[PDB]
Write an enzyme that holds these catalytic residues in place. Structure first.
Site, PDB file in Angstrom:
ATOM      1  N   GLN A   3      46.276  17.878  22.438  1.00 43.30           N
ATOM      2  CA  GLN A   3      45.220  17.728  23.445  1.00 43.30           C
ATOM      3  C   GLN A   3      43.995  16.955  22.965  1.00 43.30           C
ATOM      4  OE1 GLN A   3      45.121  22.121  24.429  1.00 43.30           O
ATOM      5  NE2 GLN A   3      44.773  21.352  26.496  1.00 43.30           N
ATOM      6  N   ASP A   6      38.110  29.693  17.916  1.00 44.03           N
ATOM      7  CA  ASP A   6      37.779  29.463  19.325  1.00 44.03           C
ATOM      8  C   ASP A   6      37.509  27.978  19.600  1.00 44.03           C
ATOM      9  OD1 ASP A   6      37.975  32.191  20.198  1.00 44.03           O
ATOM     10  OD2 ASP A   6      35.890  32.304  20.823  1.00 44.03           O
ATOM     11  N   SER A  41      50.550  24.760  20.995  1.00 44.04           N
ATOM     12  CA  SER A  41      52.012  24.828  21.124  1.00 44.04           C
ATOM     13  C   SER A  41      52.661  23.515  20.702  1.00 44.04           C
ATOM     14  CB  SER A  41      52.398  25.136  22.576  1.00 44.04           C
ATOM     15  OG  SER A  41      52.055  26.454  22.968  1.00 44.04           O
ATOM     16  N   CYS A  44      50.578  28.936  24.311  1.00 39.16           N
ATOM     17  CA  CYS A  44      49.161  29.171  24.047  1.00 39.16           C
ATOM     18  C   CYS A  44      48.521  29.415  25.414  1.00 39.16           C
ATOM     19  CB  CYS A  44      48.569  28.014  23.236  1.00 39.16           C
ATOM     20  SG  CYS A  44      48.933  26.284  23.871  1.00 39.16           S
ATOM     21  N   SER A  45      47.347  28.854  25.745  1.00 36.85           N
ATOM     22  CA  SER A  45      46.871  29.079  27.112  1.00 36.85           C
ATOM     23  C   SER A  45      47.512  28.103  28.118  1.00 36.85           C
ATOM     24  CB  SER A  45      45.344  29.011  27.163  1.00 36.85           C
ATOM     25  OG  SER A  45      44.905  29.468  28.451  1.00 36.85           O
ATOM     26  N   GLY A  81      49.942  25.763  27.086  1.00 35.54           N
ATOM     27  CA  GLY A  81      51.259  25.416  26.579  1.00 35.54           C
ATOM     28  C   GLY A  81      51.459  23.959  26.189  1.00 35.54           C
ATOM     29  N   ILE A  82      50.402  23.264  25.765  1.00 32.64           N
ATOM     30  CA  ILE A  82      50.522  21.860  25.348  1.00 32.64           C
ATOM     31  C   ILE A  82      49.779  21.522  24.057  1.00 32.64           C
ATOM     32  CG2 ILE A  82      50.984  21.065  27.691  1.00 32.64           C
ATOM     33  CD1 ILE A  82      48.092  20.084  27.917  1.00 32.64           C
ATOM     34  N   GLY A  83      48.704  22.239  23.732  1.00 33.03           N
ATOM     35  CA  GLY A  83      47.895  21.866  22.567  1.00 33.03           C
ATOM     36  C   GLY A  83      48.322  22.482  21.244  1.00 33.03           C
TER      37      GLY A  83
END
Ligand SMILES: O=C(O)c1ccc(-c2ccccc2)s1
Ligand SMILES: O=C(O)c1ccc(-c2ccccc2)s1
Ligand SMILES: O=C(O)c1ccc(-c2ccccc2)s1
Length: 284
Positions: free
Chosen positions: A262, A181, A222, A215-216, A218-220
């Site tokens: 990120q 998390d 992913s 992912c949530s 779509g940048i980290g």
């Protein structure tokens, strides 16, 4: 510089935040005008994460062709990826329309549906064989065929049917279930094992449309997945593997979607993954 020794040099000097901020400062800025139109507000999860106009995936629809998704095309590595946000309640039908239209074989999911006590994406696939899903807005049917649950990830076989034409296709769902998390994993071993399972399935290969990874936002997470895959492929292709520069590869990918990687911790984790992966590929 090489990678593994650049790595120990940044650790000893404690300069990960400065390296990462340099990347942020040099990254491309391109327009995202379609994402910001008022009619698309309920199609975006986060107001500060949008696809660029030049690389966005278009839905084959004349009413509204917008989805928060980008085509990352890596020319030297000869790999393409679609990076997208986790589907929203009002975009699950659009998501499967994209999978169909782009001829993707695989979907890679790097988050859990609930994390930190909040919903990070919709429950967009069926959980029981006998309870299929119908997406009426895009005229698709989705059925769970089989499920294999392992300690760090789950693989599912799904059947997607285009109800207009009665054509069917088999889609593979690769779900990494153990990213913490907070922060990043302590070791990259399970993430690399997962990447290799996606590769072995054919989902990343040129005989199919691009893999869909999310992912949530779509940048980290992913971004970490496609950055590690592309760097390892380049190390296999080139005469001098020590010439592969992970910061230059990341800046190339950021020409196609904003914000990839990120945090400075995600950047350090990406280096760790590529370093350990390059030893397993051969042999040290
Ligand atoms: O939405 C817009 O019109 C824009 C976003 C970014 C733009 C830009 C301007 C100069 C240089 C690089 C990008 S223009
Ligand atoms: O029908 C719906 O689900 C929505 C309507 C308006 C939404 C929205 C979301 C973010 C910012 C401003 C408006 S979502
Ligand atoms: O000096 C260096 O950095 C390297 C030497 C060999 C490397 C390699 C990596 C992956 C696949 C085949 C070779 S990288």
């Amino acid at each position: 510089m090489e990678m593994e020794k650049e790595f120990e040099q940044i650790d000893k000097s404690g300069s990960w935040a400065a390296i990462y901020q340099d990347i942020r400062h040099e990254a491309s800025d391109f327009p995202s005008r379609v994402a910001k139109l008022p009619k698309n507000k309920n199609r975006n999860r986060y107001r500060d994460v949008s696809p660029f106009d030049h690389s966005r995936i278009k839905l084959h629809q004349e009413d509204n062709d917008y989805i928060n998704a980008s085509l990352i095309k890596m020319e030297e590595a000869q790999r393409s990826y679609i990076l997208t946000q986790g589907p929203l309640p009002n975009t699950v039908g659009h998501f499967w329309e994209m999978v169909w239209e782009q001829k993707s074989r695989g979907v890679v999911m790097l988050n859990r549906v609930m994390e930190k006590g909040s919903l990070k994406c919709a429950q967009y696939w069926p959980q029981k064989e006998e309870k299929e899903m119908i997406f009426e807005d895009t005229n698709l049917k989705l059925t769970l065929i089989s499920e294999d649950i392992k300690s760090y990830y789950t693989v599912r076989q799904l059947e997607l049917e285009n109800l207009t034409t009665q054509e069917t296709r088999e889609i593979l769902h690769f779900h990494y279930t153990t990213w913490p998390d907070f922060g990043v994993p302590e070791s990259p071993a399970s993430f690399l094992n997962f990447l290799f399972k996606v590769r072995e399935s054919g989902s990343l290969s040129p005989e199919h449309g691009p893999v869909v990874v999310h992912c949530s936002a779509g940048i980290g997470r992913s971004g970490t997945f496609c950055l590690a895959d592309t760097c390892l492929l380049l190390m296999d292709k080139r005469k001098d593997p020590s010439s592969v520069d992970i910061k230059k590869v990341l800046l190339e990918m950021r020409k196609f979607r904003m914000g990839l990687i990120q945090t400075a911790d995600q950047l350090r984790f990406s280096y760790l993954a590529v370093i350990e992966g390059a030893k397993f590929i051969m042999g040290d």
